[PDB]
């Protein structure tokens with residue numbers, strides 16, 4: 012199936028294009044601002060589906076043309092008249108089509124033009140009223156506040172927020188791309204009798220700003236986004252996409268002594284934390300118990316033994332363990348425990364713990380064995 | 381300071397004893413059922429604080445004595461008459477002291493005996509009305525339903541629940557021990573003008589049972605308790621303490637091929653998941669990108685390179701990385717990426733990912749480089 016994407020160099024277009032060529036066998040024809048007139052006609056006539064993502068004015072519109080019909084949709088539809096196959100057309104209109112600002116009125120004229128055209132020529136049309144959008148590949152410093160904020164914050168550049176209480180209505184680019192694909196396969200999502208992209212968010216600029224600063228500072232405090240809040244999850248991914256390409260990595264804090272090292276990896280207030288222990292050959296660590304703190308030890312390299320002895324008891328219990336067979340040892344409360352490197356190489360143990368380490372109120376008590 | 385713990389062989393006593401000898405310099409004198417009469421007198425006369433945890437009847441009470449004063453508190457107070465120092469006394473009474481069941485009435489008689497005694501002899505008294513208790517070291521199959529449930533469930537033994545809607549009022553042993561220690565240092569927690577252990581929970585048997593089965597099944601599904609629900613956190617620790625001593629470990633599921641292995645460690649619905657990748661020397665994995673899935677790679681053994689290339693782009697970006705210096709590489713969306721083992725030994729990478737892996741709806745697209 013031949014699919015043309017107008018506005019192909021825009022945010023949604025680049026996203027839709029990358030997806031479609033990856034997840035389908037459709038032939039994708041990209042049209043944009045720089046597209047020569049003859050190859051536009053060429054692509055449109057071959058087309059089985061039109062995804063119309065272009066802005067309202069033609070690429071040729073500049074200071075000269077203040078007067079004159081400069082409607083790009085009109086021109087696109089004008090060409091499709093000769094299209095033998097009656098390709099379906101998807102129009103990205105805006106929720107501003109109800110408002111009486113000139114942008115909305117423009118968008119409402121586009122819908123109306125397309126409805127009239129469809130009724131005469133038979134094309135099936137999917138007309139969406141999209142809210143503001145966000146996601147990877149949106150140009151920063153150019154009419155998208157989220158992209159601008161992500162770009163600046165990731166660079167320690169200061170941002171300008173006039174009113175934190177301003178509410179934004181938003182769709183994430185993934186939902187836009189998924190919806191377009193549903194329309195392509197012939198089953199749009201219908202709410203209130205109209206095609207509607209799911210998962211719209213309503214968020215204040217203040218919430219957005221706090222989230223972005225949290226994502227930034229999370230690097231240093233080893234914390235993690237709340238990933239079952241859909242907006243926050245989508246926002247975190249989009250934030251990551253604005254990272255300078257030299258800044259994808261960050262050093263961890265290793266606690267180093269004669270025995271090896273202990274290093275925190277990720278910390279959460281609600282699902283514990285994970286760290287990396289490295290022990291030099293011959294080394295024993297631990298010999299302590301807890302009332303309530305508990306751990307999962309997972310040896311991923313080298314070999315050794317994890318030992319237990321109930322506080323009120325004499326029996327030592329040994330778990331022989333190595334990176335050749337991956338197995339978790341829970342560390343039950345009320346058992347003193349130790350871990351020993353029995354091999355010739357550094358032993359590395361991943362340790363999940365149920366709470367944060369606080370040496371003020373430690374919950375760990377020295378007891379050998 | 382000399383501290384005597386009556387009922388020292390009980391659940392709270394064992395717990396308090398382990399803590400006190402670990403976190404303080406106090407001399408701890410344990411008295412219990414088997415304690416000879418002369419060493420009871422001996423301990424009580426030396427005492428600076430009495431922690432009275434014993435049951436209402438004397439160790440000597442058996443079928444013979446249906447008639448007669450068999451009050452252990454009375455006897456204990458009777459001896460303390462000769463105690464020159466006026467040691468403070470902590471009494472663990474019960475919230476049943478208000479109810480007119482014989483257990484409550486017993487407890488109310490103990491309080492009343494102690495208040496009268498204090499008023500004549502001057503001892504400062506801390507009288508608590510504790511609810512039901514839970515925590516490690518509570519005997520299973522003996523009047524504690526939580527201990528019984530934990531013990532049976534951890535052994536795949538079937539449990540008997542009559543009414544799931546029965547509500548329990550509970551304190552966790554840690555709060556009991558911490559409170560006793562506060563009373564010892566002279567600053568009890570006061571609510572409503574009376575000493576009161578904080579953090580009482582109110583929970584149905586049904587909630588308890590569901591939580592315990594979740595903790596059990598979590599072993600197989602790699603999931604984790606919700607650790608910012610205090611009850612659930614305390615319950616999880618207590619559950620662990622009932623594990624058979626041969627059953628502290630569990631194997632993970634390694635996905636093994638010619639290249640090494642991939643193994644899931646922990647999975648959460650709200651803070652992502654962590655897995656372990658192991659690559660044999662010379663191996664490259666990845667060469668894919670995501671729309672929204674993102675990862676943190678942390679190399680903990682061996683050495684190699686993590687590579688990136690923006691989907692719309694030509695520039696390959698390389699992060700040289702090894703277990704000698706622990707550093708996280710974020711994997712931003714819209715970048716195809718790969719990881720290669722450059723050393724002579726297996727390379728092990730810990731990978732956090734923001735969502736569950738679903739190869740039905742995969743969010744990963746093959747693209748080299």
Ligand SMILES: [Zn+2]
Nearest residue numbers: 299301306342
């Ligand atoms: Zn430990």
Ligand SMILES: [Zn+2]
Nearest residue numbers: 668670675711
């Ligand atoms: Zn990946």
